[PDB]
């Protein structure tokens, strides 16, 4: 027997007007899947007495800010904990309702501070209230969980075998002044860029993605790690194009395209799909795509490598998607797909479902977004067994192919360079002098030492 809704809101029974479910059950746990409900019913199920629901807690705490503010959530979980009484009945209620519920709200508080501490870093009064609440919790059964929460808060307030030998080509260790596309070793370009891109991939948090906040006016405040990651990717595509169209001599430009395809081959080996696609985007750009005299002189083996990479992107990433699903970490996924799927999930589904005239929060929409962020995180756990080279790393971090130019200015310059080096038919192909005073022959993509 539970108290009245007039005294305790979470006692109100379930109905089609306050909670609705999906036909299926949690695959591994046999728990019903909540489709929609009121904030009171979602909070009740977040801290349910019958069973624990880690998947729902994980989903809720990731995606709740679209329908409930952090202050309002804390107020709701404090209310839930403060259970009033409605002998045999009283002793059973304390053990089958009050004790399990109070423990579940403490697990929520613990999951919140551990995995979503940003809410507290961003609102110091929210933490003041959490600490005040956690102070008022009493009981021998609670002390274990209350100490753990305090231990996390204070920790949050404070803040393998041998890898392969680093590969060198024309540029030697320490001689950063000569580092360039053709002087650094194609294997080391790909490894050092895979390390940068892997770290950029791993720094992106769900707080930057949930709510499509990277597309909104405050995207620079709310999605900074995602945008640094996209901007590096964009910079490498532009650098690859620049290298190509600024090599005016055909023989040297054939050598440039060929080396970039070797860097692609190594990105494929390393499962760096962001890198693979940086190269495919450069090759399919307007200035590079049209360079028929350059691509004709490219070895067939390399044409086929580039062609298979291009095909990953075809038919809405069909082959990319299957290839990613089949490989295991470490890998660097292409983020763009995730971004489009989160946006369209949020924009293509309603925030609310209406049942018998009452508004219900659409939780399934949120679950679908938490499914995408979970898949992003599964690839963020494993690092590459590759040694960092601090000078090569720095060279790629500081590439600035655009310079002080704006996007239009620069991409028009690249396109006008393309038309100059390979004019539009029936204009004859001019000749241009060499710019490289070192050998153009590649060392290959096979390691030089065992």
């Amino acid at each position: 027997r539970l108290p009245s809704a007039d005294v305790y809101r979470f006692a109100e029974p379930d109905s089609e007007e306050n909670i609705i479910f999906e036909e299926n059950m949690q695959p591994k746990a046999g728990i019903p899947i909540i489709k929609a409900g009121t904030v009171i019913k979602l909070i009740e199920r977040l801290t349910y007495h019958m069973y624990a629901d880690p998947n729902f807690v994980r989903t809720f705490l990731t995606t709740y800010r679209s329908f409930c503010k952090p202050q309002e959530l804390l107020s709701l979980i404090i209310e839930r904990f403060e259970i009033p009484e409605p002998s045999a009945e009283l002793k059973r209620f304390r053990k089958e309702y009050i004790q399990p519920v109070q423990l579940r709200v403490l697990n929520v508080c613990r999951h919140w501070v551990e995995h979503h501490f940003y809410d507290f870093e961003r609102d110091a009064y929210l933490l003041q209230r959490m600490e005040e609440f956690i102070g008022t919790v009493r009981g021998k059964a609670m002390k274990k969980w209350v100490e753990s929460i305090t231990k996390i808060i204070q920790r949050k307030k404070i803040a393998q075998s041998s890898p392969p030998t680093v590969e060198w080509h024309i540029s030697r260790p320490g001689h950063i002044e000569t580092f360039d596309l053709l002087t650094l070793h194609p294997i080391e370009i790909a490894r050092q860029l895979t390390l940068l891109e892997s770290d950029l991939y791993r720094a992106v948090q769900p707080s930057e993605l949930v709510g499509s906040v990277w597309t909104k006016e405050d995207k620079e405040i709310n999605s900074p790690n995602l945008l640094k990651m996209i901007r590096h990717t964009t910079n490498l595509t532009l650098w690859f194009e620049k290298c190509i169209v600024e090599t005016e001599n055909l023989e040297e430009r054939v050598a440039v395209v060929s080396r970039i395809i070797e860097i692609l081959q190594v990105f494929q080996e390393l499962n760096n799909f962001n890198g693979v696609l940086e190269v495919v985007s450069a090759m399919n750009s307007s200035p590079v795509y049209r360079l028929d005299h350059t691509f004709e002189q490219i070895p067939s083996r390399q044409k086929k490598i580039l062609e298979e990479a291009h095909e990953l992107s075809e038919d809405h990433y069909k082959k990319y998607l299957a290839k990613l699903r089949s490989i295991n970490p470490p890998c660097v996924p292409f983020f763009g797909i995730y971004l489009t799927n989160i946006l369209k999930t949020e924009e293509g589904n309603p925030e609310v479902l209406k049942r018998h005239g009452k508004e219900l929060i659409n939780f399934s929409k949120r679950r679908k977004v938490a499914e995408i962020t979970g898949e992003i995180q599964q690839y963020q756990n494993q690092p590459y067994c590759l040694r960092v080279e601090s000078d090569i790393k720095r060279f790629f971090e500081n590439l600035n192919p655009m310079g002080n130019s704006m996007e239009k200015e620069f991409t028009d310059y690249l396109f006008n360079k393309s038309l100059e080096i390979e004019p539009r038919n029936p204009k004859p192909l001019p000749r241009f002098p060499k710019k490289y005073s070192y050998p153009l022959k590649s060392p290959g993509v096979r390691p030089s030492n065992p």
Binding site: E217, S285, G336, L343, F415
Partner: protein
């Protein structure tokens, strides 16, 4: 085999461009959308009594991958250049989008349509006549659409298919 039209949606981010394609594909009376499945971007339609398949590419959310536009744009035969009627910057960006499409396709006459989307109850800053004037200057159709009511969505897409057929 029925004809398949590869369409590409292009436009500014942050102004609800994804609604145009989501509303086309979605059956009205079903508001449940899953961008993960093939059926979410492929639709069988009958335009002027001739059945065809529309394959629509909308990279909504990947605007910062500015060096991937050429790649994505090259997949298309027809383009929907979309702006929000409540955002003048998105309208002003159309000129460059079109210029890239022309460059990518290596053609001054690429099947294209100008779409003005009413994405929310924010105030209109782009008058119908401004967009109708711009569309005329390029020699292309202008369609206004409502993201809330589905008004104009089918006309935008069907007008593009007719532009491709009459190319």
């Amino acid at each position: 085999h029925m004809t398949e039209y590869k369409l590409v949606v292009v436009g500014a981010g942050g102004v609800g461009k994804s609604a145009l394609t989501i509303q086309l594909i979605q059956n009205h009376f079903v508001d449940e959308y899953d961008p993960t499945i093939e059926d979410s971007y492929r639709k069988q339609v009958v335009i002027d009594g001739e059945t065809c398949l529309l394959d629509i590419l909308d990279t909504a959310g990947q605007e910062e991958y500015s060096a991937m536009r050429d790649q994505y744009m090259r997949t298309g035969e027809g383009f929907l250049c979309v702006f929000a009627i409540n955002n003048t910057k998105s309208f002003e960006d159309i000129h460059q989008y079109r210029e890239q499409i022309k460059r990518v396709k290596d053609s001054d006459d690429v099947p294209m349509v100008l779409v003005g989307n009413k994405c929310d109850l924010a105030a209109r800053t782009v008058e119908s006549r401004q967009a109708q004037d711009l569309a005329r200057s390029y020699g292309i159709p202008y369609i206004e659409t409502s993201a809330k009511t589905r008004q104009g969505v089918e006309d935008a897409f069907y007008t593009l298919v007719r532009e491709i057929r009459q190319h």
